[PDB]
Design an enzyme around this catalytic site. Sequence first.
Site, PDB file in Angstrom:
ATOM      1  N   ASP A  25     -11.289 -18.435 -22.497  1.00 57.67           N
ATOM      2  CA  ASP A  25     -10.949 -17.392 -21.517  1.00 57.67           C
ATOM      3  C   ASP A  25     -12.118 -16.481 -21.231  1.00 57.67           C
ATOM      4  O   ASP A  25     -12.310 -15.487 -21.922  1.00 57.67           O
ATOM      5  CB  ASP A  25      -9.808 -16.555 -22.083  1.00 57.67           C
ATOM      6  CG  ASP A  25      -9.258 -15.508 -21.103  1.00 57.67           C
ATOM      7  OD1 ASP A  25      -9.948 -15.059 -20.158  1.00 57.67           O
ATOM      8  OD2 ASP A  25      -8.100 -15.095 -21.340  1.00 57.67           O
ATOM      9  N   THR A  26     -12.886 -16.812 -20.203  1.00 56.39           N
ATOM     10  CA  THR A  26     -14.116 -16.102 -19.883  1.00 56.39           C
ATOM     11  C   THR A  26     -13.796 -14.712 -19.402  1.00 56.39           C
ATOM     12  O   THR A  26     -14.687 -13.881 -19.228  1.00 56.39           O
ATOM     13  CB  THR A  26     -14.882 -16.823 -18.735  1.00 56.39           C
ATOM     14  OG1 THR A  26     -14.072 -16.815 -17.551  1.00 56.39           O
ATOM     15  CG2 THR A  26     -15.224 -18.276 -19.107  1.00 56.39           C
ATOM     16  N   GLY A  27     -12.523 -14.473 -19.134  1.00 53.95           N
ATOM     17  CA  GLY A  27     -12.054 -13.160 -18.692  1.00 53.95           C
ATOM     18  C   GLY A  27     -11.699 -12.258 -19.864  1.00 53.95           C
ATOM     19  O   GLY A  27     -11.112 -11.188 -19.689  1.00 53.95           O
TER      20      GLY A  27
HETATM   21  C1  LIG Z   1      -0.402 -17.500 -17.243  1.00 51.67           C
HETATM   22  O1  LIG Z   1      -0.693 -16.099 -17.435  1.00 51.67           O
HETATM   23  C2  LIG Z   1      -1.922 -15.748 -16.974  1.00 51.67           C
HETATM   24  O2  LIG Z   1      -2.725 -16.555 -16.513  1.00 51.67           O
HETATM   25  N1  LIG Z   1      -2.133 -14.399 -17.101  1.00 51.67           N
HETATM   26  C3  LIG Z   1      -3.461 -13.903 -16.753  1.00 51.67           C
HETATM   27  C4  LIG Z   1      -4.028 -13.275 -17.994  1.00 51.67           C
HETATM   28  O3  LIG Z   1      -3.703 -12.153 -18.369  1.00 51.67           O
HETATM   29  N2  LIG Z   1      -4.923 -14.135 -18.608  1.00 51.67           N
HETATM   30  C5  LIG Z   1      -5.512 -13.985 -19.921  1.00 51.67           C
HETATM   31  C6  LIG Z   1      -4.489 -13.849 -21.006  1.00 51.67           C
HETATM   32  C7  LIG Z   1      -3.388 -14.827 -20.877  1.00 51.67           C
HETATM   33  C8  LIG Z   1      -3.561 -16.120 -20.449  1.00 51.67           C
HETATM   34  C9  LIG Z   1      -2.459 -16.957 -20.367  1.00 51.67           C
HETATM   35  C10 LIG Z   1      -1.180 -16.550 -20.692  1.00 51.67           C
HETATM   36  C11 LIG Z   1       0.019 -17.393 -20.651  1.00 51.67           C
HETATM   37  C12 LIG Z   1       1.257 -16.850 -20.363  1.00 51.67           C
HETATM   38  C13 LIG Z   1       2.399 -17.618 -20.412  1.00 51.67           C
HETATM   39  C14 LIG Z   1       2.294 -18.928 -20.782  1.00 51.67           C
HETATM   40  C15 LIG Z   1       1.030 -19.394 -21.037  1.00 51.67           C
HETATM   41  N3  LIG Z   1      -0.109 -18.686 -20.977  1.00 51.67           N
HETATM   42  C16 LIG Z   1      -1.031 -15.247 -21.130  1.00 51.67           C
HETATM   43  C17 LIG Z   1      -2.118 -14.403 -21.217  1.00 51.67           C
HETATM   44  C18 LIG Z   1      -6.446 -12.799 -20.073  1.00 51.67           C
HETATM   45  C19 LIG Z   1      -7.254 -12.385 -18.850  1.00 51.67           C
HETATM   46  O4  LIG Z   1      -8.545 -12.983 -18.900  1.00 51.67           O
HETATM   47  C20 LIG Z   1      -7.532 -10.894 -18.893  1.00 51.67           C
HETATM   48  C21 LIG Z   1      -8.320 -10.501 -17.654  1.00 51.67           C
HETATM   49  C22 LIG Z   1      -8.592  -9.027 -17.552  1.00 51.67           C
HETATM   50  C23 LIG Z   1      -9.875  -8.561 -17.700  1.00 51.67           C
HETATM   51  C24 LIG Z   1     -10.153  -7.222 -17.609  1.00 51.67           C
HETATM   52  C25 LIG Z   1      -9.148  -6.311 -17.382  1.00 51.67           C
HETATM   53  C26 LIG Z   1      -7.861  -6.772 -17.229  1.00 51.67           C
HETATM   54  C27 LIG Z   1      -7.584  -8.122 -17.310  1.00 51.67           C
HETATM   55  N4  LIG Z   1      -8.229 -10.554 -20.120  1.00 51.67           N
HETATM   56  C28 LIG Z   1      -7.755  -9.517 -20.873  1.00 51.67           C
HETATM   57  O5  LIG Z   1      -6.725  -8.927 -20.578  1.00 51.67           O
HETATM   58  C29 LIG Z   1      -8.647  -9.182 -22.051  1.00 51.67           C
HETATM   59  N5  LIG Z   1      -9.383  -7.988 -21.671  1.00 51.67           N
HETATM   60  C30 LIG Z   1      -8.891  -6.821 -21.121  1.00 51.67           C
HETATM   61  C31 LIG Z   1      -9.935  -6.001 -20.898  1.00 51.67           C
HETATM   62  N6  LIG Z   1     -11.062  -6.658 -21.307  1.00 51.67           N
HETATM   63  C32 LIG Z   1     -12.392  -6.123 -21.243  1.00 51.67           C
HETATM   64  C33 LIG Z   1     -12.751  -5.320 -20.017  1.00 51.67           C
HETATM   65  C34 LIG Z   1     -12.825  -3.940 -20.140  1.00 51.67           C
HETATM   66  C35 LIG Z   1     -13.161  -3.143 -19.066  1.00 51.67           C
HETATM   67  C36 LIG Z   1     -13.417  -3.782 -17.877  1.00 51.67           C
HETATM   68  C37 LIG Z   1     -13.330  -5.156 -17.835  1.00 51.67           C
HETATM   69  C38 LIG Z   1     -13.613  -5.831 -16.553  1.00 51.67           C
HETATM   70  N7  LIG Z   1     -13.009  -5.952 -18.861  1.00 51.67           N
HETATM   71  C39 LIG Z   1     -10.742  -7.914 -21.806  1.00 51.67           C
HETATM   72  O6  LIG Z   1     -11.453  -8.793 -22.268  1.00 51.67           O
HETATM   73  C40 LIG Z   1      -7.825  -9.041 -23.319  1.00 51.67           C
HETATM   74  C41 LIG Z   1      -7.704  -7.582 -23.714  1.00 51.67           C
HETATM   75  C42 LIG Z   1      -6.471  -9.622 -23.025  1.00 51.67           C
HETATM   76  C43 LIG Z   1      -8.404  -9.843 -24.455  1.00 51.67           C
HETATM   77  C44 LIG Z   1      -3.349 -12.855 -15.666  1.00 51.67           C
HETATM   78  C45 LIG Z   1      -4.680 -12.221 -15.393  1.00 51.67           C
HETATM   79  C46 LIG Z   1      -2.933 -13.534 -14.399  1.00 51.67           C
HETATM   80  C47 LIG Z   1      -2.313 -11.815 -16.031  1.00 51.67           C
END
Ligand SMILES: COC(=O)N[C@H](C(=O)N[C@H](Cc1ccc(-c2ccccn2)cc1)C[C@H](O)[C@H](Cc1ccccc1)NC(=O)[C@@H](n1ccn(Cc2cccc(C)n2)c1=O)C(C)(C)C)C(C)(C)C
Lengths: 99, 99
Positions: A25-27
Amino acid sequence: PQITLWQRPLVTIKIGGQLKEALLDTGADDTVLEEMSLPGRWKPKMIGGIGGFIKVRQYDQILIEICGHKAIGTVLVGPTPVNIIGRNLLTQIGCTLNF
Amino acid sequence: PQITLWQRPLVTIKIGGQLKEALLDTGADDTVLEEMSLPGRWKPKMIGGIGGFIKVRQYDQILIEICGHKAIGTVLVGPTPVNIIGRNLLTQIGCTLNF
Ligand SMILES: COC(=O)N[C@H](C(=O)N[C@H](Cc1ccc(-c2ccccn2)cc1)C[C@H](O)[C@H](Cc1ccccc1)NC(=O)[C@@H](n1ccn(Cc2cccc(C)n2)c1=O)C(C)(C)C)C(C)(C)C
């Protein structure tokens, strides 16, 4: 390996002699595993992305084998719906975005 | 390009002639953008993240230019803290994971 994205990039990882699925998860800044058991001491930390925050336990210098590559780093453990390999480990195995 | 991950992969995208910043997110099924206006009719939707769930507006057939590469598709607008480019677009600019 090269991994396209038409499907979620779920890949075998091994930790503490165990196999699990996990999401590259590059995000994500850190790595976060579903609740499990781990050695060492841990510190409570709070993470949040889309939809709020959860209370996770932080372990340091944990070794994980991702797709057969060794990496040692911090790993967060709490109630995530999916094991998440973040950038803190993704760097260790020299993984990049290509196009 | 070959983008390492020592920093979050924030790139420049171009939508409706406008420039913004988005995070290339392999851990995202969907593309989700910060509250903006986009032509056409939306359908309501639910997306679950790490904290919990949020409700977003779904626009279809959206042109978006990611790092010079055109891709068309579904874009969700909602209260996200940052613009997120999801797999549904990444595949379209031939993006892959490589280690
Ligand atoms: C299928 O569900 C999804 O695809 N959900 C997606 C999702 O959340 N995907 C993934 C998790 C996941 C993946 C899969 C599932 C899932 C769910 C159900 C069934 C199967 N899979 C559940 C959760 C995670 C996604 O990358 C987000 C992207 C993101 C980035 C930045 C801000 C908000 C959101 N990353 C974070 O939340 C990370 N985060 C938070 C802040 N920072 C640093 C930062 C700080 C400050 C500023 C910035 C830019 N960054 C991190 O590194 C955490 C804290 C989770 C580590 C989304 C985006 C659409 C909601």
